[PDB]
Amino acid sequence: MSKKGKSYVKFNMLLQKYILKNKDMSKTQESEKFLSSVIQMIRAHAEILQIILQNEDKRTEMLKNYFDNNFNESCHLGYTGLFEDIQTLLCLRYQENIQDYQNRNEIIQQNTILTSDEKEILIVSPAMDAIHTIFTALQFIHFINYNKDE
C-alpha cells in the first residue's frame, strides 16, 4: 500500500473501526461467520469486481449495488457499514494503482529483453491488487477477531 495517499488513511480507520478492543465471550461468533462469508464472496467474485472497477464513471454505484445484491441483511452485530468503507478503500486503491502501475506495465510488456517469467513477475494488475489488499485487510480483521485459532 502507498502511504502518500488517502488509501492508507482509509486502511487505518477501517482497521480501527472493526478491531475488537475487548475479547468477545460468545461461543458462537455470528459476526465472524458473516466476516468469513464476506471474505469468501470477495475472493470468489474477484473477476466481476475487476469488471466493475475497470468502468470509469459509474463504478462507485455499481460497486454499491453489487454488494447490495450479493449480500442480504449484511449487518448482524459488530460490523456496521463495513461495505461502504470497503468500497471506498477499494476505489482509492484502484485509483492509486492506476497512477502507479499502468504505464509501468505497458512499458514492461513492450521490452523485448525481458523474458515472459520476469515480465509476469514484474507486472502488477491494478484491480487485482486492490481486491487483494481488501482481502488481506479482511483476513487481518478476521484473524484478530476470531477466537478460534488455525
What's the closest the beta carbon of residue 128 comes to other proteins, in angstroms?
12
- Told to check if 139 binds other proteins by CB under 8 A, we report no
What's the closest the beta carbon of residue 55 comes to other proteins, in angstroms?
7
**The C-alpha cell that represents 12 in the structure block:** 487505518
Local structure of 42: helix, strand or coil: helix
What is the Rg, in whole angstroms, of the alpha carbon atoms belonging to the chain?
17
Chain CA centroid to CA 137, Å: 7
- Told to check if 104 binds other proteins by CB under 8 A, we report no
Distance, in Å, from the CA atom of 105 to the CA atom of 98, rounded to the nearest integer, reads 10
- Told to check if 28 binds other proteins by CB under 8 A, we report no
* Choice from 8, 66, 71, 146 touching other proteins (CB under 8 A): 66
> What is the CB neighbour count within 10 angstroms for residue 92?
21
CB 133 within 8 A of CB 125: no
Distance, in Å, from the CA atom of 51 to the CA atom of 124, rounded to the nearest integer, reads 16
Q: Which is nearer to other proteins, 8 or 71 (CB)?
A: 71
- Told to check if 61 binds other proteins by CB under 8 A, we report yes
Q: Which is nearer to other proteins, 57 or 117 (CB)?
A: 57
**Residues in Cβ contact with 54 at an 8 Å cutoff, skipping those fewer than 6 apart:** 127
What's the closest the beta carbon of residue 82 comes to other proteins, in angstroms?
17
- Told to check if 33 binds other proteins by CB under 8 A, we report no
* Choice from 1, 62, 122, 124 touching other proteins (CB under 8 A): 62
Residues that bind other proteins (CB under 8 A): 47-48, 50-52, 55, 58, 61-62, 65-66, 68-70, 73, 76
